[PDB]
Paper text:
The darobactins, a promising new small peptide class of drug candidates, bind to novel antibiotic target BamA, an outer membrane protein. Due to the selective binding to the β‐barrel of the outer membrane protein (OMP) BamA, darobactin interferes with the integration of natural OMPs into the membrane by mimicking the OMP signaling peptide. As a consequence, BamA is unable to close the lateral gate and, thus, affects mechanical, kinetic, and energetic properties of the entire complex. The mechanism of action overcomes common pathogenic resistance and is effective, not only in vitro, but also in vivo. This family of bicyclic heptapeptides belongs to the biosynthetic class of ribosomally synthesized and post‐translationally modified peptides (RiPPs).
The structural basis of superior activity of D22 was analyzed by single‐particle co‐structure elucidation via cryo‐EM of E. coli BAM‐D22 complex and compared to the co‐structure of BAM‐D9. The cryo‐EM structure of the E. coli BAM complex was resolved with an overall resolution of 3.0 Å. The MoB of D22 is comparable to D9, but with N2 and W7 conformational changes, which is probably caused by substitution of T4 and R6, respectively. The C‐terminal tryptophan is pushed deeper into the hydrophobic binding pocket and forms a closer hydrogen bond with the nitrogen of the indole ring and S425, compared to BamA‐D9. N422 of BamA still pairs with the C‐terminal D22 carbonyl group via NHδ2 side chain interaction. Moreover, N422 forms one additional bond with the guanidine group of R6, probably causing the tighter seal of C‐terminal tryptophan into the binding pocket. A side chain interaction of Q441 from β‐strand 2 is formed due to its side chain remodeling. Furthermore, the significantly changed interaction and orientation at the C‐terminal end is not at the expense of one of three N‐terminal hydrogen bond interactions, maintaining proper closing of the lateral gate of BAM. Taken together, the different darobactin‐BamA binding interactions of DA, D9, and D22 likely reveal the structural basis for enhanced activity of engineered darobactins, which are more closely paired with BamA to mimic the β‐sheet prolongation and to lock the BAM complex in the inactive state by sealing the lateral gate tightly. These structure–activity based findings are reinforced by the results of analyzing the different binding kinetics for DA and D9 versus D22 on purified E. coli BamA revealing K D values of 0.278 μM, 0.3 μM and 0.159 μM, respectively. Intriguingly, D22 was found to be highly active against all nine tested clinical CRAB strains (MICs 0.06 to 0.5 μg mL−1), displaying significantly higher potency than the previous frontrunner D9 (and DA) and nearly equipotent antibacterial activity with colistin plus showing much better activity than other clinically used antibiotics.
Numbering used by the authors:
A (entry chain F): 1 to 7
B (entry chain A): 24 to 810
C (entry chain B): 24 to 234, 243 to 392
D (entry chain D): 24 to 121, 132 to 242
E (entry chain E): 28 to 111
F (entry chain C): 30 to 87
Write the structure that this text describes.
């Protein structure tokens, strides 16, 4: 899967 | 009617003097009905008066004006699929905003504007209602209620007039979609004018790249169902006959470069007309002229078509313009990133002659960096110089930090977890700093990495890494032992050919081994290392510190990253322990992959993979048994259980740590063990050779609209691993594990595609040449795992 | 994640069956039309019913017990593996020993009623989305391009073509011309009723009867020197047969057809509001707001009662004197999208899954 | 959400002043915004606007402060307290500028605003602060030019280096960056083998240092 | 490894033969172009430098120095085909 | 924000004085163009925490 969220 | 004084009733915000100036009438002049009407109309058009009444008293011209209530707030309700801020921006661009006055007649206009916006975004049944809440001091609040409705989706794409290519094959390359399976990632099924135009251009290119020089799109039609929940697209086209290319002709002010240009316009007689090739020829001529100082080398191609023979002859008109020199290159919008970060990506030098190709390449490199959302260029002129310009790059800065967390599954390692946090533009200096971690059945890994991508102006990179690793052998289909290691590593990176890349570096690693199962190979390495452990229990321990020199070379030429159809990739890696360390050895590995297409459409391909490896010790010692090479499994030889090929362990008679019947043990002393003991559990070897030949074919049953998103292959794999130090003379009763001739072979079928869970790979293979001890696993799969 | 709709679906009316309806027989055809908006529907001629599906299968059934007579598939196949659908969309027409069907591939087939063998097949300008009206030895076709073509029924060779304008965005489906006094009156996707002489196709008149707002006519009707037309989102109009000058207007329209009986006009509004107007001035005699947004089908006047299907699969009888429901039935689960066919004392209707039903009382 | 009661303007303004003196800006901004919204033409709308400019600036709401300053300048070109507004505009641009390698456009804007202030009203009370800020900004811009020339020196572009150092000697002749950059010009001239020009640059360097 | 570094004006070897003593600045600029370098320290002198250094192949430069007079009339021409 | 608060609230820095450039004999320096010129403003006003920026009472 792999979720990626920018901070 | 002469006027002696002027009076107003209702002026709140507009100044009295401003109103007097605005009104053409002035005190001390004749006034008539026409003048009164003109003043009334001017006041109405002022945009701040709702009702205007110019009445005449006995002597004074009294005016009654009901100033339009001021807008104090605009509220939205139901904008589920529309951002409130963007809706406010659209409204203020339209004209309605806070602070201004509200017109009690343009409510319908505002509602219809919002409905038009909804129609544009996709919803055709959307409705908008406006509510007005008056408030004291001539104020008002405007509230909007939205019934979004249900969006309309594409229900069919039809092409009428295609007799050589099927509609399914043609629309397979479009951006617009009419079918989306739940098991693929092909796209969304919405309708957009830009996508429709792009699809028309794609269809035109598809036909022009095949020799249909007379292709023409007669028309296009878009229809909605009466309930307005489905969209039908039709494209009426007219494909002609296939044409041949008779020849080419070049003319214009070539500037004395005719001899060099003719070589770019050489073709084989009898070739089929192509469009991509013609564009490439034009681009080649443009680059040729740009290399000679010309900033705008204009080129146009005109085809002349003869139907009697069905042949096309090109006519290329070339105009090499004038020479322009760049006086400055300016970057604006880089509030965070420093100047050099953007400047070092430029292919063009300030203070040299101009090149449009170079400017475009610099823009493309800036886009590839990843620190910006948008990049724009603007080649301005310099006043007072007829041949000088200033290049300006305008960038909007993105946010470069991120978190990521991922989950995958597979037969190789079971459930796999990944997590990390990354910062790609540390303080706008370009340094990339991150910390990552991974966990699966048999190991846990954590690392902290810091990289400088431009240690030298040419692009040489300098990176550093700190890592901790924990490895449990018995969970990986090997003989039991535990290895906990940690260390640091520093590396340089040299680009040399835009396909080739070298790297060299140094590293330090500390390894701590425990819980080692007594066996001949491990106790052969330990003796060379100087240890003399006992062979009756697995309460062991052994620690070593090593400094190594690392090197590698990579060559990448694959045309595409996902489902490549042509190219090669070669990766050589090495390592050698430099003096002063506990372990003296060297290790080398070589990866090869090659694709060869056997068609013009690149649907039938041949893939060849190889994997070689060899290592050994130097100062009378041996390579550590935890550096071994493993074969088997879906990575190397499909159809075999992971890490099953190669030598097998041979144990000593030893007492179990905590004996308990009903459990299977490796011939422990408490089960009647009095001599050496064979096994079926792999240990690896220090030499490895693996090869695989694969044939990639179109998927047979899947619908042709999306059959290019699934890859189908038939494969044949060979592999072998061996231990060159195994002395067969001493152990005569056991197999010779130092023979390279024990080749394991399997054959079968495999499928790959991208799913909502990530990449999916499935394989079924049948190992038809295997040796005693090897464990077969025909069905293998991997779900969403890319780490 | 959630979804919503602007207009709430109307509830199923509760009525007490004055009489009990039945279902004499039901036969199956392969997959019907599905979710696609098609004009395909069965036809009756000489005690036998012809049906088809979008894939290409065409069947003839006995009108009394539903027994199959012949069946032929018009889908071309490149061997035993490849099979591309014919995409049949033009309603089945029968006249003079032929079965005419249009196709989304700009093809018109004329099969034989006796054997099911293709008598001829012609290529037209575009998708044949309309019922192939037959008149005076000609077969009129309204293609999706806005072109009205006239084929020969015996040869199949196009005689004349008339070009009509099309807007940027339209509604799916096309109007079927009606022939009266040696002239064909048709409607356009731009909201204009036009008349063409069938000898060559020369336009006689054409006028706007319309109010992103669209306006599409879809099959006017002609009686006693007058032409009644409906434009979607526009207005009903009864115009003269010679000059085309509007006589009277009513701000109500729809895409599905309407019927004219005696001195009354039965139609279904865009919002599924059944009405019953008059011919003199169109003053409404009654209305039914019980089925709003139920997606009704074209009304059919069977045994003196209007019959309409709906997407949910229910078939409703409604009186004509006052408009009060006289019977309600549940027939199919897939629903009804295409018009019912009433003729020769029979009422046949095809569901979205191809199941042709014969209903009785 | 920081709801403001419909109290009389005098009382709400007194509360706003008290909170400004206390030193909390978030609530004072809400009070002043509510007052302005409810009384678009109140007796002290101009005072509300000035207090709002001050509060937006000191609350780090620089875009809103800039919008308010622009509106105020457009509407009241002859307001006696306009020099205060131009000083505030310069301060806001310096704050946005906030790192000499980065974008100098805000430094240029601040320099323009302070120059207009000092050249228009030399008898104002903000003129000394304006001049000190002008000196700082001129040095910052010279430093940006020096950074670009220094990058091109390592890139190896010897015409860009001399052109940029000449632009420095022309625009910013009296800063430390120019003195630091003169050797870069000499090196570029020598690398292109223009010893005649390198000698002149060396003469300047020797005569100055 | 690295890209190619270009600097100065592009001299074709035909334009340089087109300039003769006695020409004005306008004529010289028309023939060759606006120089990327002049002399800012008083005297008027135009430097036409043509420097190119392709990818790790070596540097080649040509220099053309044009010395005018107070009235902008060419007085001296100096040509260096290659840099020592 | 965090970088911006320091500037917006209280920070103040004093840079080096601007000094003229000498021209060796036999040559001159490039022209100045007066684009970035600081006029001399006499007077000793407030600066650097001694100047109050609160709006005047008008």
């Amino acid at each position: 899967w792999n979720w990626t969220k920018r901070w | 009617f002469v006027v002696k004084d002027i009076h107003f009733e209702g002026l709140q915000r507009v100044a009295v003097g401003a109103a007097l100036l605005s009104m053409p009438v002035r005190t001390g002049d004749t006034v008539n009905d026409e003048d009164i009407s003109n003043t009334i109309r001017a006041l109405f058009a002022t945009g701040n008066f709702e009702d205007v009444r110019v009445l005449r008293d006995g002597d004074t011209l009294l005016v009654q004006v009901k100033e339009r209530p001021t807008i104090a707030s605009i509220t939205f309700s139901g904008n589920k699929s529309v951002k409130d801020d963007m809706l406010k921006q659209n409204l203020e661009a339209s004209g309605v905003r806070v602070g201004e006055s509200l017109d009690r007649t343009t409510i319908a206009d505002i509602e219809k504007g919002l409905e038009d916006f909804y129609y544009s975004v996709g919803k055709y049944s959307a409705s908008v209602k406006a509510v007005v809440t008056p408030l004291p001091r001539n104020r008002v609040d405007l509230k909007l209620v939205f019934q979004e409705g249900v969006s309309a989706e594409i229900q069919q794409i039809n092409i009428v007039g295609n007799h050589a290519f099927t509609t399914d094959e043609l629309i397979s390359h479009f951006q617009l979609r009419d079918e989306v399976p739940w098991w693929n990632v092909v796209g969304d099924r919405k309708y957009q004018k830009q996508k429709l135009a792009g699809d028309l251009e794609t269809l035109r290119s598809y036909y022009l790249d095949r020799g249909y020089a007379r292709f023409n799109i007669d028309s296009t039609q878009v229809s909605l169902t009466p309930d307005k929940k489905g969209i039908y697209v039709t494209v009426n086209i007219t494909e002609g006959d296939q044409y041949k290319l008779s020849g080419v002709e070049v003319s214009g002010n070539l500037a004395g470069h005719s001899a060099e240009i003719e070589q770019l316009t050489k073709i084989e007689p009898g070739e089929l007309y192509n469009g991509t090739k013609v564009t490439k020829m034009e681009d080649d001529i443009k680059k040729l002229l740009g290399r000679y100082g010309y900033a705008y080398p204009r080129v146009q191609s005109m085809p002349e078509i003869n139907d009697a023979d069905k042949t096309v002859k090109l006519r290329v008109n070339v105009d090499a313009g004038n020479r322009f020199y760049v006086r400055k290159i300016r970057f604006e919008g880089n509030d965070t990133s420093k100047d050099a970060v953007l400047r070092r990506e430029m292919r063009q030098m300030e203070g040299a002659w101009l090149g449009s190709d170079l400017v475009d390449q610099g823009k493309e490199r800036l886009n590839r960096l990843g620190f910006f959302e948008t990049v724009d260029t603007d080649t301005q002129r310099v006043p007072g110089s007829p041949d000088q310009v200033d290049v300006v790059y305008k960038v909007k800065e993105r946010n470069t930090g991120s978190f990521n967390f991922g989950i995958g599954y597979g037969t190789e390692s079971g459930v796999s977890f990944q997590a990390g946090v990354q910062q790609d533009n540390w303080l706008g200096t370009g340094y990339a700093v991150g910390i990552n971690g991974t966990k699966n059945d048999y190991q846990t890994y954590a690392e902290l990495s810091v990289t400088n991508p431009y240690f030298t102006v040419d692009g040489v990179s300098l990176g550093g890494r700190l890592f901790y690793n924990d490895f449990q052998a018995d969970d990986a289909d090997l003989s039991d032992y535990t290895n906990k290691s940690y260390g640091t590593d520093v590396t340089l990176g040299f680009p040399i050919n835009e396909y080739n890349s070298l790297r060299a570096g140094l590293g330090y690693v500390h390894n701590s081994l425990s819980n080692m199962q007594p066996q001949v190979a491990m106790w052969r390495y330990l003796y060379s290392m100087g240890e003399h452990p006992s062979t009756s229990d697995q309460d062991n321990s052994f620690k070593t510190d090593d400094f190594t020199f690392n090197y590698g070379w990579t060559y990448n030429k694959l045309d595409r990253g996902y489902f490549p159809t042509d190219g090669s990739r070669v990766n050589l890696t090495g390592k050698v322990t430099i003096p002063g360390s506990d372990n003296e050895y060297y290790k080398v590995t070589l990866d090869t992959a090659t694709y060869v297409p056997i068609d013009d459409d690149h649907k039938w391909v041949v893939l060849g993979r190889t994997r070689w490896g060899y290592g050994d010790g130097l100062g009378g010692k041996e390579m550590p048994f935890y550096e071994n090479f493993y074969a088997g499994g879906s990575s190397t030889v499909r159809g075999f259980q992971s890490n099953t090929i190669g030598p097998k362990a041979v144990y000593f008679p030893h007492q179990a740590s905590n004996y308990d019947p009903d459990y299977d043990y490796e011939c422990a002393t408490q089960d009647g063990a009095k001599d050496l003991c064979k096994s079926d559990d792999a240990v690896g070897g220090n030499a490895m050779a693996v090869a695989s030949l694969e044939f990639i074919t179109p998927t047979p049953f899947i619908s042709d609209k999306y059959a290019n998103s699934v890859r189908t292959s038939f494969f044949w794999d060979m592999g072998t691993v061996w231990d060159t130090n195994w002395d067969s003379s001493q152990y005569s009763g056991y197999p010779d594990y130092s023979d390279p001739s024990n080749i394991r072979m399997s054959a079968g079928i495999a499928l790959q595609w991208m799913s909502p869970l990530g990449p999916l790979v499935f394989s079924y293979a049948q190992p038809f040449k295997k040796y005693d001890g090897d464990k077969a696993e025909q069905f293998q799969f991997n779900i969403g795992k890319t780490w | 994640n959630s979804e919503e709709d602007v207009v709430k679906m109307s509830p199923l009316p509760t009525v007490e069956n004055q009489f009990t309806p039945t279902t004499a027989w039901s036969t199956s055809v392969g997959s019907g039309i599905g979710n696609f908006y098609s004009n395909l529907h069965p036809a009756l001629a000489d005690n036998v019913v012809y049906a088809a599906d979008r894939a290409g299968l065409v069947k003839a059934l006995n009108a009394d017990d539903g027994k199959e007579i012949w069946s032929v598939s018009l889908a071309e196949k490149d061997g035993w593996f490849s099979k591309e659908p014919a995409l049949l969309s033009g309603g089945v027409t029968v006249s003079g020993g032929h079965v005419y069907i249009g196709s989304e591939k700009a093809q018109v087939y004329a099969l034989n009623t006796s054997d099911g063998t293709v008598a001829w097949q012609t290529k037209v300008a575009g998708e044949a989305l309309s019922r192939p009206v037959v008149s005076d030895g000609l077969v009129l076709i309204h293609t999706s391009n806005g072109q009205l073509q006239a084929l020969n029924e015996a040869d199949g060779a196009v005689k004349w073509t008339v070009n009509l304008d099309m807007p940027s965005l339209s509604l799916r489906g096309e109007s079927a011309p009606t022939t009266a006094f040696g002239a064909a009156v048709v409607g356009g996707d731009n909201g204009r009723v036009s008349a063409v002489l069938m000898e060559q196709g020369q336009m006689i008149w054409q006028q706007r009867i319309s109010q992103r707002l669209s306006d599409v006519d879809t099959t006017p009707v002609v009686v006693n020197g007058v032409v009644f037309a409906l434009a979607y989102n526009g207005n009903l109009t009864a115009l003269d047969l010679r000059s085309g000058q509007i006589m009277w207007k009513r701000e109500l329209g729809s895409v599905n057809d309407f019927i004219v009986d005696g001195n009354r006009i039965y139609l279904v509004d865009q919002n599924d509001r059944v009405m019953a107007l008059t011919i003199d001035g169109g003053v409404t005699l009654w209305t039914q707001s019980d089925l709003l947004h139920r997606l009704l089908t074209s009304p059919v006047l069977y045994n003196g009662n209007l019959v309409v299907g709906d997407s949910e699969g229910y078939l409703h009888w409604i009186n004509v004197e006052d408009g009060r429901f006289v019977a309600q039935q549940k027939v199919d689960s897939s629903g009804f999208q295409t018009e019912p066919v009433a003729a020769d004392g029979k009422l046949l209707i095809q569901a979205k899954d191809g199941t042709v039903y014969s209903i009785t009382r | 959400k920081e709801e403001v009661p419909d109290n009389p303007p005098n009382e709400i303004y007194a509360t706003a002043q008290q909170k400004l003196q206390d030193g909390n800006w978030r609530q004072a901004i809400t009070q002043l915004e509510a007052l302005d919204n409810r009384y678009p033409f109140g007796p002290y709308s101009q005072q509300v606007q000035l207090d709002l400019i001050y509060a937006y600036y000191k609350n780090a709401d620089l875009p809103l402060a800039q919008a308010a300053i622009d509106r105020f300048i457009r509407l009241n070109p002859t307001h006696p307290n306009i020099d205060y507004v131009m000083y505030m505009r310069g301060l806001t641009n310096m704050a946005l500028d906030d790192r000499s390698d980065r974008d100098p456009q805000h430094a240029r804007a601040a320099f323009s605003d302070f120059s207009k202030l000092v050249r228009g009203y030399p008898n104002s009370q903000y003129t000394t602060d304006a001049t000190k800020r002008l000196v700082f900004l001129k040095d910052r811009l010279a430093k940006y030019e020096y950074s670009v020339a220094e990058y091109y020196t390592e890139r190896g572009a010897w015409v860009a280096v001399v052109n940029r150092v000449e632009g420095m000697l022309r625009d910013y002749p009296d800063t430390q960056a120019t003195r630091d950059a003169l050797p870069l010009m000499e090196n570029a001239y020598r690398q292109m083998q223009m010893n005649a020009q390198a000698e002149k640059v060396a003469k300047i360097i020797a005569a100055n240092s | 490894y690295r890209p190619d570094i270009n600097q100065g004006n592009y001299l074709t070897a035909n334009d340089v033969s087109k300039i003769r003593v006695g020409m004005t600045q306008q004529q010289v600029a028309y023939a060759l172009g606006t120089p990327l370098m002049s002399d800012p320290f008083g005297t008027n002198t135009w430097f036409y430098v043509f420097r190119q250094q392709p990818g790790h192949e070596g540097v080649t430069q040509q220099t053309l120095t044009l010395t005018f007079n107070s009235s902008g009339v060419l007085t001296n021409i100096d040509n260096k085909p290659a840099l020592s | 924000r965090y970088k911006r608060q320091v500037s917006g609230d209280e920070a103040y820095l004093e840079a080096a004085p601007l000094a003229e450039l000498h021209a060796p004999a036999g040559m001159i320096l490039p022209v100045t163009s007066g684009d970035y010129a600081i006029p001399v403003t006499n007077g000793s006003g407030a600066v650097g925490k001694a100047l109050d920026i609160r709006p005047p009472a008008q």
